[PDB]
């Protein structure tokens, strides 16, 4: 089981393949200087950056990863934490040269690929100790999947998390939504969407070619 960082896989489009090869070369060179670890949405990270506004003094922000988005050199991830009761989010750029270190304090996967609903969840689910110690990751073991289901705050939420389009599975809807509210959400359900074969984007061949480039760079 080998993990390919999501930003390496390009999105569908008409971009010339050479553009991705050139960008992947720059990405691999930056990875030699800075070790970018494997992490997922739901993992706890501590990111160290040099502060331009504080004369380059290093800054550390610890938070749970709630989103990984972007492709290529610009790919980003958002870390969320509650500091002094204030919810804070920072969108970090993986390949920004300011980043000194990216440490995975805890490596795990949550039920959802996005945790933006944590903004609407109880503050405890977004509160992580800034001085917590890294838990060891056993060699050659599957990434643990955290099955926690969060309890939400009273509506209205930032987004209608119950609607099928989000496909959220990490919220205790039964505690916060009545049966009628749940059924009303199903109106927007699109059963045909999952069976639209032409919408499928198969990256198996693309990922295989990328791995050859990744291996070539490591050898040289």
């Amino acid at each position: 089981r080998r993990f390919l960082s999501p930003e390496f896989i390009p999105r569908r489009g008409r971009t010339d393949p050479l553009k991705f090869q050139i960008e992947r070369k720059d990405m691999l060179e930056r990875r030699k200087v800075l070790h970018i670890p494997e992490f997922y949405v739901g993992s706890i990270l501590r990111v160290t950056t040099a502060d331009p506004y504080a004369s380059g003094k290093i800054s550390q922000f610890l938070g749970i990863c709630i989103q990984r988005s972007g492709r290529g050199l610009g790919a980003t991830f958002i870390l969320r934490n509650v500091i002094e009761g204030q919810g804070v989010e920072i969108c970090f750029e993986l390949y920004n040269p300011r980043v000194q270190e990216i440490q995975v304090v805890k490596l795990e996967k949550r039920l959802d690929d996005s945790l933006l609903y944590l903004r609407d969840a109880l503050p405890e689910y977004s509160t992580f100790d800034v001085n917590m110690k890294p838990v060891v990751q056993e060699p050659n073991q599957k990434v643990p999947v955290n099955e926690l289901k969060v309890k939400m705050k009273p509506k209205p939420w930032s987004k209608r998390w119950e609607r099928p389009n989000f496909n959220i599975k990490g919220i205790r809807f039964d505690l916060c939504l009545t049966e009628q509210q749940m059924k009303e959400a199903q109106k927007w359900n699109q059963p045909w969407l999952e069976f639209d074969m032409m919408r499928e984007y198969d990256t198996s061949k693309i990922e295989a070619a990328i791995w050859k480039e990744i291996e070539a760079s490591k050898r040289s």
Binding site: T49, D51, P52, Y53, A54, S59, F61, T76, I83, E84, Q86, G87, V88, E89, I90, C91, F92, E93, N96, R98, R119
Partner: protein
């Protein structure tokens, strides 16, 4: 981020900010030509039946990369001469204020946490 009528949270320890009032503090004027307030922008507030200048230290709207985004729209009260009404700030404030154009050393001096 902050516009006229935007409700704001006072994050200093000033009596005016922390005093209980039925009406939440609301922005009534933004001191920018476009009327859109960002971090490090002064505004006028309607707080406890008074008009007090405030400085935006945090807002919900997403900013540039590597910058903190806050759950609430945070402001600190300042006098007309620029002195802060409160003596302490406990809510984390961004460090980008230091190099933003304008006077922010007074606010940074009373800030306990930086993010």
């Amino acid at each position: 981020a902050i516009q006229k009528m935007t409700r704001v949270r006072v994050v200093d320890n000033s009596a005016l900010g922390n005093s209980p009032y039925h009406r939440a503090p609301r922005c009534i004027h933004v001191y920018k030509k476009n009327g859109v307030g960002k971090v490090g922008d002064q505004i006028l507030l309607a707080i406890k039946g008074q008009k007090k200048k405030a400085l935006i230290v945090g807002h919900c709207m997403p900013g540039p990369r590597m910058t903190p985004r806050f759950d609430s729209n945070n402001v600190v009260l300042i006098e007309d001469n620029g002195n802060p009404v409160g003596t302490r700030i406990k809510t984390p404030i961004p460090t980008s204020l230091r190099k933003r154009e304008g006077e922010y050393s007074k606010v940074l001096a009373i800030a306990q946490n930086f993010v």
